[PDB]
Amino acid sequence: TVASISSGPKHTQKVPILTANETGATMPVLPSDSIETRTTYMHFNGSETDVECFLGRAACVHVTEIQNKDATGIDNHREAKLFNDWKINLSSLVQLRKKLELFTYVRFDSEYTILATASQPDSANYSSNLVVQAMYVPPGAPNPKEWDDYTWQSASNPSVFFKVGDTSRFSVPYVGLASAYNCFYDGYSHDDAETQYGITVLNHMGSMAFRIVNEHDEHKTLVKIRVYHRAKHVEAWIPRAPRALPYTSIGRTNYPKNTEPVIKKRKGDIKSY
Amino acid sequence: TVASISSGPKHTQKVPILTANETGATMPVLPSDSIETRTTYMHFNGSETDVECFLGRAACVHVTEIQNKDATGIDNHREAKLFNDWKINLSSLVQLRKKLELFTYVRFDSEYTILATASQPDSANYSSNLVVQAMYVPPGAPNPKEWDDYTWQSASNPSVFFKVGDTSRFSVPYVGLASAYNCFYDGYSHDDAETQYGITVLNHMGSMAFRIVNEHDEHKTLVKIRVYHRAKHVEAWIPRAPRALPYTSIGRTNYPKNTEPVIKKRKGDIKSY
Amino acid sequence: TVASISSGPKHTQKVPILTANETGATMPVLPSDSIETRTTYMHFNGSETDVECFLGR
Amino acid sequence: INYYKDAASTSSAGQSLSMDPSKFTEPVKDLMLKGAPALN
Amino acid sequence: INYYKDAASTSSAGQSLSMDPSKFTEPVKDLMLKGAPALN
Amino acid sequence: INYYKDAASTSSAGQSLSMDPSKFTEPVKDLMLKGAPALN
Amino acid sequence: GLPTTTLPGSGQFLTTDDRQSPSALPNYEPTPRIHIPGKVHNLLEIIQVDTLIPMNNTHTKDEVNSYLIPLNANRQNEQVFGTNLFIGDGVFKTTLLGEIVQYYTHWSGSLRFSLMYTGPALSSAKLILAYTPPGARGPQDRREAMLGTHVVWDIGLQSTIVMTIPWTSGVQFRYTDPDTYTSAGFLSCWYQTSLILPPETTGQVYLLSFISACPDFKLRLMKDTQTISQTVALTE
Amino acid sequence: GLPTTTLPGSGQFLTTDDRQSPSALPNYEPTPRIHIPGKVHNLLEIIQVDTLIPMNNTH
Amino acid sequence: GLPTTTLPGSGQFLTTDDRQSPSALPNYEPTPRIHIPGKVHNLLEIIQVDTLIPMNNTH
Amino acid sequence: GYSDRVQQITLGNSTITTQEAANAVVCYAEWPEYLPDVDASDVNKTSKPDTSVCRFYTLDSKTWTTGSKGWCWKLPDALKDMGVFGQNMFFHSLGRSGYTVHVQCNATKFHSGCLLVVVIPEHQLASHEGGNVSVKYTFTHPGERGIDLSSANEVGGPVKDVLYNMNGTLLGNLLIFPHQFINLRTNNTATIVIPYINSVPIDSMTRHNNVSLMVIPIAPLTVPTGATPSLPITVTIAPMCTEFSGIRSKSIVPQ
Numbered sequence A, B: 001t002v003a004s005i006s007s008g009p010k011h012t013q014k015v016p017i018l019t020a021n022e023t024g025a026t027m028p029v030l031p032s033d034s035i036e037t038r039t040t041y042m043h044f045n046g047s048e049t050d051v052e053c054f055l056g057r058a059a060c061v062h063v064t065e066i067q068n069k070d071a072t073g074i075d076n077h078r079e080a081k082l083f084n085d086w087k088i089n090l091s092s093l094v095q096l097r098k099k100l101e102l103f104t105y106v107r108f109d110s111e112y113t114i115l116a117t118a119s120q121p122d123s124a125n126y127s128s129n130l131v132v133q134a135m136y137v138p139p140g141a142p143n144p145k146e147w148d149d150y151t152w153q154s155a156s157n158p159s160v161f162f163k164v165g166d167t168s169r170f171s172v173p174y175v176g177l178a179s180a181y182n183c184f185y186d187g188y189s190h191d192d193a194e195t196q197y198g199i200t201v202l203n204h205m206g207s208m209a210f211r212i213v214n215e216h217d218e219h220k221t222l223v224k225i226r227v228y229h230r231a232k233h234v235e236a237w238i239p240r241a242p243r244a245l246p247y248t249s250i251g252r253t254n255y256p257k258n259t260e261p262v263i264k265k266r267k268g269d270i271k272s273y
Numbered sequence C: 001t002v003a004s005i006s007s008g009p010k011h012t013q014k015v016p017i018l019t020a021n022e023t024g025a026t027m028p029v030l031p032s033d034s035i036e037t038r039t040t041y042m043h044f045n046g047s048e049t050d051v052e053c054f055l056g057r
Numbered sequence D, E, F: 001i002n003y004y005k006d007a008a009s010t011s012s013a014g015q016s017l018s019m020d021p022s023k024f025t026e027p028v029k030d031l032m033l034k035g036a037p038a039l040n
Numbered sequence G: 001g002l003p004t005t006t007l008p009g010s011g012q013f014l015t016t017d018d019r020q021s022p023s024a025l026p027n028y029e030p031t032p033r034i035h036i037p038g039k040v041h042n043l044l045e046i047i048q049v050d051t052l053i054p055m056n057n058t059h060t061k062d063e064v065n066s067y068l069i070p071l072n073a074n075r076q077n078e079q080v081f082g083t084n085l086f087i088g089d090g091v092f093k094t095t096l097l098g099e100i101v102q103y104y105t106h107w108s109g110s111l112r113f114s115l116m117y118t119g120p121a122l123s124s125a126k127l128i129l130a131y132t133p134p135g136a137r138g139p140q141d142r143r144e145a146m147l148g149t150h151v152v153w154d155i156g157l158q159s160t161i162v163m164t165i166p167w168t169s170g171v172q173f174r175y176t177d178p179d180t181y182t183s184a185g186f187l188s189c190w191y192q193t194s195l196i197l198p199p200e201t202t203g204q205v206y207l208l209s210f211i212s213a214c215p216d217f218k219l220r221l222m223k224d225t226q227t228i229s230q231t232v233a234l235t236e
Numbered sequence H, I: 001g002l003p004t005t006t007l008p009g010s011g012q013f014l015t016t017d018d019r020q021s022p023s024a025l026p027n028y029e030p031t032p033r034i035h036i037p038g039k040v041h042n043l044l045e046i047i048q049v050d051t052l053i054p055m056n057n058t059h
Numbered sequence J: 001g002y003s004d005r006v007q008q009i010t011l012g013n014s015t016i017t018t019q020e021a022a023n024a025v026v027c028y029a030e031w032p033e034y035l036p037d038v039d040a041s042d043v044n045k046t047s048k049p050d051t052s053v054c055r056f057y058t059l060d061s062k063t064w065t066t067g068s069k070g071w072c073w074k075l076p077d078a079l080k081d082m083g084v085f086g087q088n089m090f091f092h093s094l095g096r097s098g099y100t101v102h103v104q105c106n107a108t109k110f111h112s113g114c115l116l117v118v119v120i121p122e123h124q125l126a127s128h129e130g131g132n133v134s135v136k137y138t139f140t141h142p143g144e145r146g147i148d149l150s151s152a153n154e155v156g157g158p159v160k161d162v163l164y165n166m167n168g169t170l171l172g173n174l175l176i177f178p179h180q181f182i183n184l185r186t187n188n189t190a191t192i193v194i195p196y197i198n199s200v201p202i203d204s205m206t207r208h209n210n211v212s213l214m215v216i217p218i219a220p221l222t223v224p225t226g227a228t229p230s231l232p233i234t235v236t237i238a239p240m241c242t243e244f245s246g247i248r249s250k251s252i253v254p255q
Ligand SMILES: OCCOCOCc1cc(CCCCCOc2c(Cl)cc(C3=NCCO3)cc2Cl)on1
Pocket: A088, A089, A090, A091, A097, A100, A106, A110, A134, A135, A136, A158, A159, A160, A170, A172, A175, A181, A182, A183, A203, A205, A208, G024, G025
């Protein structure tokens, strides 16, 4: 492939460099339209800018935490982090979020990696070996109320059991209801006067639920869960302007008030170098 | 292959042993040009002197250390070794350095092995099990400021998570900007009067960043990281004189003052055996 | 596979929507027996409702 | 590839792709045609 | 070799090697030739 | 068998078995024959 | 039982590796795809669309006005604007090009810089745009500027002028984050003759300026952008 | 000895995965199947049989 | 699931072994090679060039 | 003697002529088309009123003055009350449509000024409150009036800051969306053909707008000396290939 062809002096009536940008086109002008060039080859394919590659590496999408401790006398397991949950979503952590929102609709399978590490902040004789269990919990299946409810039987709901310190990995097909996931949605769930705006009404995928299977030892053990997400089989439509201001909320486009100028001011003139 | 052919008495006008070294050549003289020889075969190929073999074994290129401890009240994580970094480079440890600098330009893929072991120098009930994470951090991606910054999300930056005591291994293609890496560079980054000389201005590859993912236990744990590097797919050009004096700096050729004579003095005469 | 065929106005002596449930049958009535439909395809096989799948986790 | 000798040890079965609701939805003795009168 | 039955479980896809910027760079209704006048 | 997609991930290269010292040992412009006088 | 040996790296999680995994939802059937206009395949497809450069960066809070390069009637010989070409920083940095370049470590290729004139139709002007390849200082006067890559632009019916910064380089890749060795030059613009307004007209006229990449362009070695960060996880 | 590398997920138990296992009862012979009317293959077969709706829910 | 057995040496790191590894930079395209005079292939090529001997070591 | 410059668009019972055009943009290089069966889901036959809905409606005019910040209309909202298009809209459960948008602004060869005319698929607005405040319905359904970016923040309304596109992105990059400029010195109209863009084959026309049309002054209007300091901008829009499905009782929507 040639990156530049050889081109010499020109004295024409045919001027490729004068255009009318009002038309909305970006005319494909090249170095050889306005200087004299020599042949050179590309030596490159643009492999690593493919959208599959761009969205295809694992990104941290969520960090939560649960603890193993005596539940005796706990009136609210959920509240003691005896177990916990995640209202699933991807736009919670921003690094990956800015990348996805370069597109309007996106379609992909997900591969998830879950790393779990334990901490024992206060005096323990040892490090126990805990098994985590972490059940998907669809929009419409009982949310588990205690850390050892019938829910955890998970007879119809996929669940994975792995050890703290290890990693769990599995992959879920594209579960969207439509043909693509909306990265943006300028609509409502119905025409009510006070319903929520955005995608949070679309992006309704149920939540994920972690717990330790082990009963309690004499000390307490903090287990912190990190969920990583990798898109595989990516398809993206309609590019948009990149995010400039900071994010404030999952699912709304809102930016913070009295934010700071995002364009760097010159130290000098327009004329400055 | 014959290592020596059979050759007998000679009384010629054709003298292969008289030459003129002023020409710059090393004339290919053999035993059979000046004594009577018998046939012998080589029985050998020179396999283990191939440059791929010479530069192809893992060498320790870096030892760093980070600790897991309560960051509560630490004003400078980087400074507490709560995490740490490496300004990537290869000429930091000398064994491998002398080997590479036998050549002027070198091109290869790298395979890296990272061993992490833990130490608990002061009273602990136990040995905790820590997971290390160690993100590449290109010349132009945010350097992570705390041990748990958004940076560690590493949504676009390759990172590996492995356990202390284990080893991590992965391989990075030849990332040089030119066609080869310069082992030497007699230039500057621009024609300023005070800019730095050498390759340190060329050899600008960003740094590598390690941290423990675990929160803190009651005791403190020292984790010491050793990075090993193995060249694979090696290509080397222009041999040079081997390094004689000791090294003083990454990237400059400078030797120490009042160094010692590097040529061993005879215990005796020129005539001595 | 078609999920619905195209069907238009009807003025018949042949009424598929009147039945006698006392018989014990569930007559296979479709949208196109009582409204005007357009063609659409199924795009689906019913894979995940197989009893092997239902009892297989 | 089965690595094991016994049939019980093989993985899940593969979709019936059988599907015939008529034993349940139309177990009538004399065939009913949709469109023809139910009771003649 | 896929070891798994479902398509979601396969590795990353392979490069589009599609690449056609004209839907974005030249969505004009009447074709513009480089070198010819923009507005006639 | 390569298990990985990228070339950097393959094992070490295999012996040049190239070997030609003359660029280093005899870079002279006019060819010198062993046995003939060095300087004529 | 077949004998195996495990190698260094066993059990590691590399966020960039690409392997198979069990599906959690065996046998599930995804929604059919329908057609949607606009599919993107390569980021290289989109960085060829031009977007506006806030060249007039001299303000103090972001404003629509930093997209406008002003022009003065009747000045002769003088300089309209100047900038270095660190596409990953400074004016370029918020543009789509700048914004994507920042996801990669290295770039190589030609850039297309165009200026669209917005003054009254009955006015006229001749400007010179100059590209100064690495190695010299930003030009200080047109004489200096005109000795490097330049285009005399004659403002006419055809409203825009497309200047190309042809890839001039020893090393075949440059860093997107500004680096010296790897630096790309300067871009300046001066009056060639001068802007002239028709009667009954007055004041400043402005040029809009765009940047996009030529088909020439290469970007490699993905990394994280300095353009976005956060201090606590967001919630709904 | 063939060189291997284990990936993330090794040792996990996913209730939905489908793999082979050793049989605890090697060589055992199950009872023959006889014919039984009524076999169900898909839940889609049965949701087409109609059932009564307690529409008058007001009690 | 295929049955395996691990041998002595599993998990060791031998600095001299030569195996495959995942690339951290999937799909990256290295700079083209250009021609450079002087390529070395074997250390045996270079030890045939003669160099001076500090024979007079007596200093 | 055909110029890129003169054009005629006849759609239904209405025709537009421009003698000073700058080509026309067809979003993503695709022209509006009906919904194919292979893409269909709802089993209902759809209704295609054709020429009674696919004609040109001219919205009420705006006034560009030196202080203008820009205006924003949403589709199909802007047309919610135009003739039979609108009735169909409130009466069917689902509908789908593409449009031809023609923005008009003429001046003289002494004026200067340049407007950006852009179509943004799925333009989800931001609350000026920050945090996770929502933007109430009424605020994103201004009807033919559209939203005036130089009007004041209101409560439950969107933010109206132009350098941020009403969503946290910079004005400068709107050029990645199908768009066309109106530069008084060149141009006097802008025309964009919009194909139907959604993640579902057909949708509700009232709970979801699928494009915002935005007209933004970028180079300020500058009139000749002692000229009146303002110009009107007119927007005329025509639904094209419209289909409605799932007819019934007639939606009732807030406010
Ligand atoms: O705003 C950013 C981009 O917008 C596009 O869409 C964003 C998005 C991404 C997702 C994820 C959907 C849910 C993933 C599939 O769910 C799971 C999970 Cl998260 C875990 C398991 C699981 N099984 C055993 C253990 O865990 C199974 C399923 Cl189906 O939901 N919405």
